[PDB]
Each structure stands twice: as C-alpha cells, then as structure tokens.
Design a protein around this nucleic acid. Structure first.
Lengths: 56, 209, 7
RNA sequence: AGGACCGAACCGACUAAUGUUGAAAAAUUAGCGGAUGACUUGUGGCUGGGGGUGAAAGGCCAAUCAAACCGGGAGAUAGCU
RNA sequence: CACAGGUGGUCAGGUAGAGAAUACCAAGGCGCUUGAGAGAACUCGGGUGAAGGAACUAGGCAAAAUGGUGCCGUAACUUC
RNA sequence: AAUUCCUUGUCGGGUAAGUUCCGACCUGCACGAAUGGCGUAAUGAUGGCCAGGCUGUCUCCACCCGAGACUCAGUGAAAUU
RNA sequence: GAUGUCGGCUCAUCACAUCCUGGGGCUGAAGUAGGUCCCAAGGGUAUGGCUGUUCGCCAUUUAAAGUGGUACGCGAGCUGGGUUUAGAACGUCGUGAGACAGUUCGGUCCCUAUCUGCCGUGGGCGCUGGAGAACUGAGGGGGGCUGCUCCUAGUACGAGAGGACCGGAGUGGACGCAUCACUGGUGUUCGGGUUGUCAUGCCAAUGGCACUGCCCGGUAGCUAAAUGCGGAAGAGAUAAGUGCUGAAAGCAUCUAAGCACGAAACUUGCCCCGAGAUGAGUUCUCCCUGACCCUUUAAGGGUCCUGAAGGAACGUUGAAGACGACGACGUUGAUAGGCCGGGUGUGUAAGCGCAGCGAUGCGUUGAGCUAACCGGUACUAAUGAACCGUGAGGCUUAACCUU
C-alpha cells in the first residue's frame, strides 16, 4: 500500500520522461483575412476559409 | 494446397429438400491475382503472394504501386502469401478463382475475431463468480487469489488475468463446404467463422482431413 | 483488543 | 376502559450494504421497535471522585472511568529497555 | 471545515387520500462552489431475465414476495 | 435437558439421504422443588426445526440504466521512507 | 518496538509412493471380470442430506471421484460458522472473587500499490542512406479427457451360465474456441396501454413528475440456454517389455559387435505469438545524382540552395479502443450526420364523418410513428497549405567489371 524505500530524484525524472507537452506543429493561415488560426477552427475575428463567418 | 482470400458478407441459412436448415457463412471470394512467386533459389522457400479486391489509386503509395506494376496487376486492398506443396506451379499475374474449392468439401477459415476490449477474468477465462451475498465485500467478480505464500513468493508466468480479449488471429477448422458459386464469386461454409461482417477471411482446404 | 484487528 | 391494536410526527437502534486517511472521532441508505405511557421534550435546579447516580452493563459522571479532570508532593521509583 | 450529523416553539393552501402518510402542485425558495469528454476491467446504487426454484449458505443473509376496502368464512388451544 | 463426558446414546417420526429438530426410553458422567420444581393461554426486532408461496441465493451468469474508475483543464492531500 | 490462526469461497501450482484412461510380466490368468508387480504425470479426477467442521456416515452418480508438497498454498483476495475479549445462563469446582479447553445465546475483519512479480497496452532508441510492404522461424505458449450403442459376433473361449481380444462405425458427457443464421434473454435511445397530479387559455390533443410511475411488446448491438468446430491420424526416438542372429563360456544366452519391435510420456505433426533472435535475418518495390567557405584536416564544422519517397499532425470516423495504439476516409470524396427508398417493430395516429343519451364503436386505415439495420444520395462537415523527414549513403579484405 505504501513504499518501503524513498524513490530517488532519478526515478522521479524517468517517470516524467513522458510528461512533456507537444506544441502545435503549425497554424493555418486564412486565405482572405490573413491571420493565423488552428486548423479547422475559425479565426479570432470570425473568419473561416475566407468566408467571414459570424463575428458579432 | 494454396487457399484464397475472401470477405465475410454475413450469415444465412440454406433449406434442403429433406427439411434441414444449414447455417452458412457467405464468403465473397473475388479473383486472386498473383503478385509474386517465391522459390528456393532466391527466397529459400516456395510460396505465392496474392492480392484481391481494389484500392483507391490516390491512396496507393509509390512503393506499393511499383510492386503491383512489376507483376502487371491492379492494386488490391492487401497482400497475402500461401505456401506451395511441392507440386503446385503458378505464374506472376495469374488469376485464381473460387473454382479452386470445387471439390474440397472441407476448409479452414482464418480471420480476426471481434474485439471485446479490456475484459475481466469472468468473461475472458470463465472464472467463477464469488458469492453475491452472505457478507461478500466488494469481491463479487474479482479474480481472488493469484498465487501461494512465501515459498514461491511470486506470481507465475502465464497466470490468467484480465486484459485484452479478441481482436486477434483465430482459425476454425474442418468447416463443410455447402456451395461454390463461380458466377457470383460466393463460397458458403456451414457454421460461423471468426470476425465481423466485411472483415478479411483466409480460406484454405482442411489440413486435418 | 477485541479479537481480530480491531474488533 | 386499556403500561390495548395498526400507523406519521416524536423517541428508539433489530438486520444488511456502503463508508473505515469516511460527508460523519458511530453516520448514510433500505427495512425494523415503541408511539396515552414505567412515554417524550424545553427551561432552571440538586447530588462530586473511594464519592455521586445506576429497571445493574462495572454502565454513566464534558469525545477521558475497575476510581474524572486540573495543579502540586515531583526530577515518585524503574535490579528494566 | 461554507462538515450528508444535532437543535425548542409558532404558521399549516390545492387535487387524490382515513390522514401532519404518499404522489403531483400553489405562495415562496432552490439546482446543493470544479467542470468537459469517453462509454474498458472492477467497485457502488438500481432495472429485466430462458429452464430450474434454496440445489446457495453456518443460517433463505440479501433479494423476491404479501400489501387496500366491503362481504363471506375462520382450527388446535385458552386464564374465555 | 441452556444441565449427558462417553455420544452422532437407542428406537420411532420427518428426508432419496437428518451429528440439528420432534416424540418416547432412563445407564440423571454431573436435574430437583422460592439462589424455587413442573406446567402454562397470550406476548417476543429472542434460540432451534419443518412446510406453502417467492425468487439471480444458487446451477451460471447475460444485458441494460446511473455514480466512480479512464482522458483533458483547474486546484491539490496522506500513511511510509 | 506483531511472521493473522480452523473450515468454506475464489484462484491455483508442483511431486509420483498412479484413482481413471495408455503399455507390459506373472497368475491358484478358460472367457467375462479380477489379483499382484513393472513402465507411464499427457489430460481427466461427483452432486447432495447431517455437522462450523477437515474428516466421517448416509443417498445417488462417474471411466475415475488418487495420495501428498506449496507459512497443515491462498483474509494488503472474500467470508467469520469454529476458536479466543468485554454481556448472560446451565452443569461442575470454590466459603468467595471467580474458574472449566464442559455446554449454551449474543458479539466492529482497516489499508488509494512505491519496488519485485503477473496480465494487458504504448513511448524512446537501436538494427549503419531513407522509406512502404510481404516474409523466413531461433524461441515461447495453447491444445492432449472420456462414456455408451451398433457391426465384427452370440463368433473365439466355455459342460453350462456367460462372453471377448484385434478392427471399424455412430452418438453423447465435461471442457475449449468462434459466431449471432436459427431458438431466446436484454434492449431506461422504438411503439402502445394505463393510474394520480400539474401544465400547455379551454375542448380535443400532448408534455413534465411519480423506480423507465406502473406495465405489454420490441430494432440494432451484446449475449447463452442457442449452433458450428476442435482433442486426432501420421512420423521420429524410446520406457517397462518382447525378440532375431551371436560369442565370451564347443552348450546356453535379447547383447558384449550387429539387427527388429514397443505407451495418452519425449521430439514433431495441429493452433497462436514471434528478428530487441543486439546472433537485431531474408525478399520485392520506391525516393534523393546541388554550390561554396572555414579549420586543431576528419566518419570534422558552417553558409546558401534544395525538402524527395514517406511520415506525422489536423478533420470526418470504425463491428478498433481505458488512454496510446490499430483500421477506413478527407472533394479526383459515401468517412460521419442529415436526407430519400426499403425493412423491422408497435398495432388501425391526428383530423373529420357516421351510430349511440353516454362511456365508446365504426369508416377514412394495417393507419400513424418508427433508434443503432439495409440499399442509395455530396445537402452539412471532412480547406489550399504548413510541419517532420534530405541531397547517393564508413573502413578493411576477397572475388568480379577488366572470367
């Protein structure tokens, strides 16, 4: 139920070798508005594939 | 001898004149095109590589396209190999139809069984369920003991435990061949075979015999 | 103190 | 009429499951007993430690009871760890 | 502890109901101070179940079952 | 026998099969008459036993509805060493 | 300054002094059926009544209901009936407090897994240019049970009664794997009936809540009780055992030379995993054919140009799935939803008309509605890109090109 010995800082680091985050490979660029956005997501200004989706 | 690659269409029944219903699995066996022939001199063993079906042209990688181009056959949905029994000769580009099973009368069907995901010991290994009442505390379907005391001091390899069940290669042997329809490219075998509808099946003549 | 731990 | 009957409030706590570093230093859920009486409850009062009270279990006397708690004798004594 | 506990009195709507039980509502007050997904084992709280029906188990534990009103009818025994 | 060691006493009942139960027998290890003996209707969340009904208790588990478990974001313990 | 105990449950694993099945010698072995010993551990090896029991007795099965080791296996897996706290009685002992290995009724079983181990599933790097596939099989697991009936044959055997070996066929029990066509379960996402109440202004018609309110059916999926299949045959080398030829030892002798048989054990045959098999294997296919500088001049570093095969990511998703992973698809498109048609299920909607005082009935009408299913359909979403991955791939030696 509980440890018999204190795990080392080395063991702690090994377990965390899979905890690293992965950055987005790249951001798509709207053809009309020109700003960058997550692929398949609307831009901050309400554009998507240069169609000017609702922006209110 | 060599077998064939088919697709599981489904299950139905065949009514005979003597009032007997035969449960049959319908297998679609399209023409199998030989894509490569292996011999002792070059590969160290005798076998034939076959392909069946069709694949999207845009979804065939160049390394695969070159392999099909050398054999001069259209790309299929996969590649499978069959060993030759020291008396069979095949040529690259040859087409093998379902007529191969015209007088076989018994075949072995291999496929990928349905995937049950993570399964408990009761389902996976038919472990007996413990008491549902009479004081049982949170131990209704648990495995129970998994070993002995200090002497071994370990759990033995191969212990039956919960884990992945299904979604693996399975072979059913000695299935009667009910009907062979060359025109419709159909093969009816009595009984059920591994896998779900639309999955790939490998049909070979019965080895036991 | 009551038989089995800790009844 | 009834320490009468069935049954809510109210007062109890027979069984099971859960919980057991709990929501809770004894509770929750589903059942269960009494329910005009030797009943239950608010407020205030009285009984003080070898003493109290006890339809009596060594029960209870501020989460502590085969002798409460706090301070003092006190740095008791410990041929034992 | 912003804790499923404890805490005396007063007020007592509608339909059904014997009822302050219970169900659904009024006046009124709340959704309980982490959410979003997934839909494995296993645990918890529940629903249903072929054929059998206590073979379970220390033990019918648990669960299932009975359940209301009117009429008819009602044994041994008894301190009547 | 809430008492009987030998003991699952012997016989009968109940069961296909009964160390329990019920009725007798009396060899009462070690009952016995107000630390009462033997009966006793009613009563009992009391002990033992047998039936009908009932069922996932079981043969033997299957499916389903929810809360966790699992993944993401925020916050962020514990025993042990 | 704690190593939890009898029995049960769950899950086991090994030994062989073998219970069954298999192979043999002897027999006071006619046959059937037995006795005894040898070889053999592959698999298999009861349910109930009573009792806390292990055990035992009893009932009824089975080819058999083996004997032991594993902390008298297994409570950080369950149970708590027994034993062994505090309550209370009986018998008994004691003046008494109390006591008994006498009985009797009652009586809290905690722990979120760090490490080893085990069952599953991934990431990293390696395998010497990179990449997509198909394989070889070193090695490792799984599986290995058996009854009954019929034929041979009422033959061999036997005075009769009784009754075979060998061989062949059929059909079962238990167990295992797969599957959902059939028979069924489930189906709180489908339809309908119905009680109470509230609401939609009201009627009519619907909805909320009451365990899905209570119920009757039921699609897909999952699933067993449902229906398919499996254990093998064969081969190699043997065990006990039986032999042939044959000396030592003129004979005899299964053995010393040589040679032939011989079992569910052994090695294969069957099924699955499997090149991290660092001993990192084999086969097929695909991709890259720039220009300079520096210097401690080498498997060296840097700049510019270039970015392939392929991969990954993202999106729509799956009879794949805890998460990763795996599979399908992304407009040159049926991947998912919607939509269209069909099927299935429920069982004649609503509205209107007619009959009746009315509850209701009847016609329109097998109507309406209908989830996961089937066949179709770009209506919606799956965006052009970007990102990763490079630019011919070391040395030595040999044979070849230039046998």
């Amino acid at each position: 139920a509980v440890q018999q010995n204190k795990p080392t800082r080395s063991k702690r680091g090994m377990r965390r070798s899979h905890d690293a985050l992965t950055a987005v490979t790249s951001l798509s660029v709207d053809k009309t508005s020109g700003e960058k956005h997550l692929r398949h997501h609307i831009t901050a200004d309400g554009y998507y594939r240069g169609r000017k989706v609702i922006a209110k | 001898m060599i077998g064939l690659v088919g697709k599981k269409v489904g299950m139905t029944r065949i009514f005979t004149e003597d009032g007997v219903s035969i449960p049959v699995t319908v297998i679609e066996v399209e023409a199998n095109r030989v894509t490569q022939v292996k011999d002792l001199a070059n590969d160290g063993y005798r076998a034939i590589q076959v392909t069946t079906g069709a694949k999207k042209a845009n979804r065939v990688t160049k390394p695969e396209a070159g392999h099909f181009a050398k054999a001069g056959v259209e790309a299929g949905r996969g590649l499978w190999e069959f060993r030759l029994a020291e008396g069979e000769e095949f040529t690259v580009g040859q087409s093998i139809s379902v007529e191969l099973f015209a007088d076989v009368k018994k075949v072995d069907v291999t496929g990928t069984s349905k995937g049950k995901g993570f399964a408990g010991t009761v389902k996976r290994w038919n472990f007996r369920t413990q008491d549902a009442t009479h004081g049982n505390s949170l131990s209704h379907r648990v495995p129970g003991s998994i070993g002995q005391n200090q002497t071994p001091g370990k759990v033995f390899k191969g212990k039956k435990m919960a884990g992945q069940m299904g979604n693996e290669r399975v072979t059913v042997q000695s299935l009667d061949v009910v009907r062979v329809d060359a025109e419709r490219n159909l093969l009816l075998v009595k009984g059920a075979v591994p896998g779900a509808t639309g999955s790939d099946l490998i049909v070979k003549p019965a080895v036991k015999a | 103190x009551t038989x089995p731990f800790x009844x």
